[PDB]
Write an enzyme that holds these catalytic residues in place. Structure first.
Site: not given
Ligand SMILES: NCc1[nH]cc(CCC(=O)O)c1CC(=O)O
Ligand SMILES: [Zn+2]
Ligand SMILES: NCc1[nH]cc(CCC(=O)O)c1CC(=O)O
Ligand SMILES: NCc1[nH]cc(CCC(=O)O)c1CC(=O)O
Ligand SMILES: NCc1[nH]cc(CCC(=O)O)c1CC(=O)O
Ligand SMILES: [Zn+2]
Ligand SMILES: [Zn+2]
Lengths: 340, 147, 340, 340
Positions: D133, D135, D143, D210, D220, D232, D263, D290, D329
């Site tokens: 990515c 981002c 992204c 996603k 973040r 997003r 995700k 997270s 994690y």
């Molecule tokens: N493109 C970034 C990305 N790739 C994986 C998730 C992370 C998953 C997590 O929050 O643990 C994210 C963050 C986002 O989509 O904002």
């Molecule tokens: Zn991204």
């Protein structure tokens, strides 16, 4: 100056081209899954307990309440035009006929059985279908026997309905169509016919999917079968109830139905399609109800649509949705139209 | 010249129109022409104009010919001249063609589909809900049905 | 110098482009298979045997144990805000009430039946659902009648559960929700309602898919229904048991369930999806359990997520997975949020 | 006196009995469609551009931002405990690194490529996955490459993303996981790998499904990749968008994905189930984000649930929904727990 813009195009994709299949009148006929024929038409009849009756039903254009003595002359032309079947509806007008258990429903001297006997004699080749219900014979106007609270009494109801159906078959009806919509009545009716040794000669046409709505109006005028002390919202399916309708179709089929009827028709074409998948091995019949029928007439008079055109469109719609039989008040018209 | 629809020139013109509306600010375009493969050209046009990510393509995938478009011809004065639309709009009995049209339009980029008429074609809506299960289905209650 | 590299690309493929369908707020609403409405919300109630109760349940934020005399004032605002249904849970606190067969379960003087009567009188338009189980009325704290060894006794259990369910319906409950998870209880309950002539008026909402887990904690505090001498791992489905869950869904449906409940919710969204396919013709309900509810609150306080946001996300998730009904402690909040 | 009532029962139906399949601990293991093993665990890593880093991420309990020089000592124990794979996330902190096209994304001197080289050398048996990515490398925090209006620029974006992915593979990454969610990036990445002659050695793990939500918070903070000038919501799927998710899964598969990632996880278990049907022949991976991870910790501290218990429950849930891989994690904990 604003000029016509044309975007750059790519060669035509073969998969895009469907036009080759319906650019000719004959082709549009070939594209039909089923073609409309005279033998798919079922004309309803409202037999009155007054043998000399021939009363016009206000809310039902071109339809009347006929008595046995006027049946011959009415049926003659139709049968000559190709009519193959009729669905009987009794309209006992004599006072003191209606009661709490619909006793008059299978009265041998009643309009329905009298009608069966007449037809079997005067029009021996006609297929006789009888609607089975108590609504037109109950003092309360409901489809079955009620509880003191006014709620439907399943057991007593199906017990009474089964008797009625078997009695019509005993009188000579070729087929019975229970339109009560009460839980498990198909099973009791089938068992009753079996015990009466008539299951091999009686077609059970179940109104498997009968929804409650605003389209049964005019019918309540021709047969005077309007509810009293409530509506039929507890037995007839809710307009939004697809799941229940699908379950009702499977249930009725499993209970012995030989064919199923979807009522209303046009307003429930999706249910007809569902039925054509669930009850794929059974004949599906569409019932163009009084409200739908009267609606077309009204719109026609208002010049919104053309009678013949919309009639063909709506009826072809039933066939498209999967039906192979049609109970319609437009039968007389179709017996003519289909000739041309 | 014969009066029959000219696919190529038609979709080429239709694609331009759709992109222009989007360029003007329309959030979504709904082609109701019913001409073979117009969805593909419209989608490609939006892609080339860099508007495909912001423009929803609502295709009248299943539009049947009938007696219910009357009143509409009065409000917009769009009545045929020298014939009917029976050659592009689906025949009332054409379920197979309708199903093929739905799959085609979906494959061509439609983001959603419209079934017209509505009430008189509820079975087609049901067919569409299975074929185009992942896309939003829209019912169009036409002037004739409404009237 | 490291510079940004861009690989040679091919023209965009139409099949790749999905963005045209959700680039606007309204579009994201159109993309939803089902939209969340106030009438899909079912608010649980913990009725205590102390008519003047209004105790706060520690492990259950903003939720209390109400007595009949405090029900009116509590319900008034909610019903005014759009509340259409509630699920009753009895919490008999008086000593000597609990026993080996959950006698108090259908005690006419108990909180549940007392609650039914009150609601049917003060809030006649509210839909009354009653959870059916013995766990809160047994001295051992288990969902059904036990064997001397401590293991569940199916026969006696379903026999007792069926009685309880019919009794609640007799008291006036519109729907019964057996959360016992004991083999074949749905069949006995349905048969019982049939014999009591209440099957046509009683909706059977079976907890067809109820898994054992670490998310029922707070609930054991509000109703004091915690196991004694073991866990419920022998009746409640194992977290990894998808096959059993699917079999339980089919079983309950076949046994007469009118709708099914998936518990927990969020942690079992895949099971909700499975249920939406198996029980496609029946309404599916998601139960946002105490543990899940308390988990959201905790995370919110910790600033991990936003209450309103995650609540909407989780609840919309139920609808996405196929549910059309939701039993949640966040009902009061949603009755507000859905207004804006 | 109110006494316990027991309704008359019928002999138990064999079809009701499911209890015989999970009355023993071993049985509950046999009922699992998939059993959790150490090799299904994928541990995320946040590599900083400061080789001596080892900063704790506030919003991410027990997780830190590691520099290359601290990688060896951190990884040693984990690998010894059974760790088989890791997913790299770059966190370039040096000023003037971020720009409009994410130039630093594939910077050979950057944390990701530096991390790949280190791991391939010190832990040659570890499977290296790299998130793909822009981002975390864009000045705007989005992204992909943007248009002047601020909207995503598909063409330039996938062109840049494809380059990055191929570069990571060129550096030695065994697998690439594009988490951008931009239309058709999978096709360009696959084509890029083909042209670089690395498609036969590079596994493409697409974040096919996603969704946008309130659960990416803590992330973040660990990578400082927060949006700027909007959200997003235009590229990530809407929480209610099941149809789009299903279409995205089919698309990515058709574009060359070797496996897919769902995700969030727990909050999208139904989507995992959908993916297990659509992408039945490909390995499905669950990403415990997270927010979900931090949510469990918060609830645990609040005493709402038990860490180990809920962790096992949630992770077993992924397997039940169809996943066979898990990015979490909690990997370090599981490497221990799975031993007992
Ligand atoms: N493109 C970034 C990305 N790739 C994986 C998730 C992370 C998953 C997590 O929050 O643990 C994210 C963050 C986002 O989509 O904002
Ligand atoms: Zn991204
Ligand atoms: N049980 C009566 C019955 N059987 C068939 C329909 C008549 C259809 C029509 O209105 O033409 C009705 C009327 C009703 O359901 O109220
Ligand atoms: N291409 C015109 C168009 N697009 C939508 C419908 C209008 C629907 C209505 O009649 O309300 C029509 C008219 C037509 O097909 O003749
Ligand atoms: N048989 C009791 C019952 N019925 C509904 C859930 C309550 C759900 C919640 O915890 O909020 C429980 C508790 C249990 O299974 O332990
Ligand atoms: Zn009737
Ligand atoms: Zn219980």
């Amino acid at each position: 100056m604003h000029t016509a813009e044309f975007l750059e195009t790519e060669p035509t994709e073969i998969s895009s081209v469907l036009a080759g299949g319906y650019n000719h009148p004959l082709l549009r006929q070939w594209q039909s899954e089923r073609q409309l024929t005279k033998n798919m038409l079922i004309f309803p009849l409202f037999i009155s307990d007054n043998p000399d009756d021939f009363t016009e039903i206000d809310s039902l254009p071109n339809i009347n309440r006929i008595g046995v003595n006027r049946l011959k002359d009415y049926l003659k032309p139709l049968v000559a035009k190709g009519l193959r079947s009729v669905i009987l509806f009794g309209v006992p007008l004599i006072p003191g006929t209606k009661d709490p258990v619909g006793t008059a429903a299978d009265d041998p001297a009643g309009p329905v059985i009298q009608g069966i006997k007449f037809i079997r004699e005067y029009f021996p080749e006609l297929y006789i279908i009888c609607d089975v219900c108590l609504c037109e014979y109950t003092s309360h106007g409901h489809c079955g026997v009620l509880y003191d609270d006014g709620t439907i009494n399943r057991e007593r109801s199906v017990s009474r309905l089964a008797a009625v159906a078997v009695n019509y078959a005993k009188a000579g009806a070729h087929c019975v169509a229970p339109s009560d919509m009460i839980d498990g009545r198909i099973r009791d009716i089938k068992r009753g016919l079996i015990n009466a040794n008539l299951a091999h000669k009686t077609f059970v046409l179940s109104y498997a999917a009968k929804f409650s709505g605003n389209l049964y109006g005019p019918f309540r005028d021709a047969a005077c079968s309007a509810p009293s002390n409530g509506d039929r919202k507890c037995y007839q399916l809710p307009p939004a109830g697809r799941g229940l309708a699908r379950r009702a179709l499977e249930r009725d089929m499993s209970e012995g139905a030989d064919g199923i009827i979807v009522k209303p028709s046009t307003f429930y074409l999706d249910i007809m399609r569902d039925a054509s998948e669930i009850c794929k091995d059974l004949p599906i019949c569409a019932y163009h109800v009084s409200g739908e029928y009267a609606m077309l007439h009204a719109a026609a008079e208002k010049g919104v649509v053309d009678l013949k055109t919309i009639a063909f469109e709506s009826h072809q719609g039933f066939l498209r949705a999967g039906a192979r039989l049609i109970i319609t008040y437009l039968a007389p018209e179709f017996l003519d139209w289909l000739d041309e």
